[PDB]
Amino acid sequence: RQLPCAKALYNYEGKEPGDLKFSKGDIIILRRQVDENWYHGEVNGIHGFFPTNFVQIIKPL
């Protein structure tokens, strides 16, 4: 089956171990929605957290 996923609208990264780094246009697999403001997702087997408003959902969780 197709995994939940989203397209990055903007670049993101951070200095916390858990921040997911990505560029605008990247396709991110969604793994968990922490709260209204944060997802856990992954790109290329690298996991981390990022803001919900920085992506456009393709397939929801």
Numbering used by the authors: 134 to 194
What does the article say, verbatim?
Aromatic residues cluster in the core of folded proteins, where they stabilize the structure through multiple interactions. NMR studies in the 1970s demonstrated that aromatic side chains can undergo ring flips—that is, 180° rotations of the χ2 dihedral angle (Cβ–Cγ axis)—even when engaged in stabilizing interactions in the hydrophobic core. Here we capture ring flipping events of a buried tyrosine residue in the SH3 domain of the JNK-interacting protein 1 (JIP1). Our data therefore suggest that the conformation of the aromatic ring at position 526 is determined by steric interactions dictated by the size of the surrounding amino acids.
To study the size correlation between the amino acids at positions 493, 517 and 541 and their influence on the conformation of the aromatic residue at position 526, we carried out a principal component analysis (PCA) by assigning a size score (n) to each amino acid according to the number of heavy atoms in their side chains. This analysis reveals two well-separated groups, with the SH3 domain of JIP1 belonging to group 1. To test our hypothesis, we determined two crystal structures of SH3 domains of the scaffold protein POSH (‘plenty of SH3 domains’), for which the first SH3 domain belongs to group 2 and the fourth SH3 domain belongs to group 1. Consistent with the PCA, the crystal structure of the first SH3 domain of POSH (POSH-SH3-1) shows a staggered conformation of the corresponding tyrosine residue (Y172), which is stabilized by CH–π interactions from L163 (position 517) and T185 (position 541).
